[PDB]
Symmetry: C3
Subunit: 207 residues, 3 copies
């Protein structure tokens, strides 16, 4: 496991990691290595599992991204990475449009084709996936995930670890609780509590 | 109310105004002032209500944008602005793709991530909101509003002041009447008359 | 029918052709001529029907695009063009984001605002229409058509000549058979066989 000086360490080596790697390279960043629970991905070597993090830090790598789709796991691994002395970078594709009044956390993925409008706040470890739209004055909690082609109208709040499937939509002013799942294509027209699953047009809670 | 020379006056100081301000600045335009019925927004001073328009014109400002979401109101205020001697500019985000055969009116908002294809006609005071798609040979009436992430297939006609909610879709060749509302996520598969509300997949008129 | 040296020949002169012409011009390509079964389109001369292909080749034109929406017809005309000695170019709008690990066939249309992510494979004569999203590890069969604003999540396979209408969505890992149609707005949550029509949220086969 000999590595170049100064690139980004990736936690996770799956399909999401592939996209993240390409976003980072599109920005001229170098990806140093992957750590994966199954101890290459688009040419990036897998050097071990998370027990390899101290070794990576020791050799001077200090920048990291958590490329894990599962929200609760991603959040846990981000904490672990920070404990081990890594800084969480953001992976923002060059094609994404992020308004200058947007507040970004750390460890955030913003994929190709995204637009994020004025005065939106994006928590640590959020994923804003390919082609998603976030309108003005939105609030995205830590470790939430807006799936590909999803869209939030203005003033929408998304709780920690919530997940919106491909093409989900939320109308203005709606609040979605922590740990909630909106199925693919769901159209959310009223506030959703924590820890529910909602599907359909309009979205309805499924027990 | 002392102002710089030569920028754009904005009617409206809400969330839509924020997005419009950022589109204009992204193009290197200067925003001079806001007039708002409640007499700053992202650093632009609110100088009064619409009774301040003559004063603004008198001091040499002549370029204006109406950043009001409500379609009928926007249309009325655009007329008022023109009567007071202002020219209505367009607010086209740099990231929008507007085909070279598109005909644009005046006072049109075209947000980040939009694509508008060949031989489409876009009426005065239309809003083409964030990430929306307008396919070839479309006709958008004055003061209509295509909401974020909405999409029109080819040959679609949208009447004056119609409103398509977040993620609405229209199949090829459909005509939607003036003053009609398509709810968020509605999928329009047949012509809609004037002054109706249609929701669902497929969209159905709700009395 | 006198033509400049070296441009692209277009089969088809309809609305799709208009969009394709503009994509090619946006890349600095020249469009030489159209052949259309009704023997100009945005300034490109219509020189005859497909019986004019040998004459075009004879005068030195060797690059061609098939701008025909109907998938089975497009596929047949692509074969005819190749038999007549033409190379099928791709028509990729400058604004499209095509990952560097994507495999592209020939005769592929990739419209404005598209994003295609890592390790996706795109067959000959596919159409990836305006604003569509193709996530990582997707497989698009020859002559399929992803309509405007459609979206595929990760690991989706689309069979030859399949058609997804405006705003259709497919969840991860789903396979859609050859010659299948997903209606506008359909949300595909399970594999679809060949030669079916599926509509709704979730999409259901209609006999
Ligand atoms: C809603 C969802 C979470 C349900 O998953 P699940 O509980 O494993 O459900 P199943 O696949 O077993 O389907 C259960 C039922 O839900 C229906 N259903 C599934 N997904 C649906 C959706 N998105 N909208 C409406 N109905 C849906 C099914 O048709 C089935 O109905 P039945 O009881 O009549 O058959 C899932 O289908 C989904 O939408 N995932 C989105 C994933 C995504 O986009 N990932 C992108 C990542 S980047
Ligand atoms: C359709 C719409 C206009 C209805 O507004 P409203 O009449 O105030 O309706 P309500 O919120 O009181 O809901 C009334 C009913 O319609 C249903 N409904 C609401 N919006 C719906 C939609 N978009 N699709 C399907 N059903 C919808 C509700 O579930 C409720 O059903 P019930 O009678 O079983 O409860 C609205 O919900 C909508 O879609 N707005 C889109 C706004 C938008 O996108 N703005 C972005 C601006 S840039
Ligand atoms: C599904 C589709 C193929 C059906 O076409 P069709 O069989 O000619 O159907 P019709 O227009 O005669 O409508 C038949 C019925 O299907 C319903 N329907 C039509 N399209 C529907 C859709 N996309 N989703 C749900 N229901 C739909 C109709 O409401 C009607 O219902 P009814 O029997 O209660 O009236 C078509 O409406 C469609 O979605 N086309 C998408 C085209 C597209 O996007 N082109 C873009 C090209 S770039
Ligand atoms: C955002 C996306 O989320 C999902 O992508 P994903 O890349 O996270 O999922 P997978 O392709 O299954 O890959 C998960 C990877 O995550 C690894 N992994 C799983 N658990 C751990 C962990 O504890 N530590 C580390 N270092 N790695 C772990 C797995 O061993 C595996 O290689 C899929 O649902 C995609 O369809 C979706 N694009
Ligand atoms: C396009 C969008 O439309 C809506 O946005 P919006 O910015 O128009 O709406 P609001 O945030 O309520 O702001 C409306 C603003 O418009 C002002 N206003 C309302 N009436 C007038 C008027 O007559 N003249 C002037 N000069 N201003 C007027 C209000 O006092 C208020 O500041 C919301 O529904 C957003 O969610 C949506 N993005
Ligand atoms: C991708 C899109 O597909 C469809 O567009 P399209 O451009 O193929 O369809 P149309 O506008 O009817 O044009 C089809 C053109 O295709 C021509 N055509 C049809 N059959 C042939 C053929 O055999 N050879 C040649 N050379 N041309 C043929 C027709 O004479 C006509 O000019 C429409 O459904 C659009 O709404 C959609 N954007
Ligand atoms: Cl690298
Ligand atoms: Cl300014
Ligand atoms: Cl040309």
């Amino acid at each position: 496991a000999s590595l170049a000086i100064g690139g980004v360490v990736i936690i996770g080596g799956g399909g999401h990691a592939k996209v993240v790697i390409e976003s980072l390279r599109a920005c001229g960043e170098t990806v140093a290595a992957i750590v994966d629970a199954d101890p290459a991905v688009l040419g990036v070597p897998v050097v071990g599992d998370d027990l390899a993090l101290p070794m990576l830090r020791e050799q001077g790598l200090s920048r990291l991204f958590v490329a894990i789709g599962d929200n609760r796991l991603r959040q846990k691994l981000g904490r672990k990475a920070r404990d081990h002395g890594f800084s969480l970078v953001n992976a923002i594709h060059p094609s994404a449009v992020v308004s200058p009044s947007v507040r970004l956390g750390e460890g955030v993925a913003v994929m190709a084709g995204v637009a994020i409008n004025a005065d939106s706040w994006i928590g640590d470890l959020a994923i804003i996936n390919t082609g998603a739209v976030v309108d003005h004055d939105c609030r995205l909690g830590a470790a939430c995930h807006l799936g590909p082609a999803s869209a939030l109208a203005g003033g929408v709040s998304v709780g920690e670890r919530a997940f919106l499937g491909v093409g989900a939509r939320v109308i203005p002013g709606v609040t979605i609780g922590a740990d909630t799942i909106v199925g693919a294509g769901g159209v959310v027209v009223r506030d959703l509590p924590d820890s529910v699953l909602a599907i359909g047009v309009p979205a309805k809670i499924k027990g």
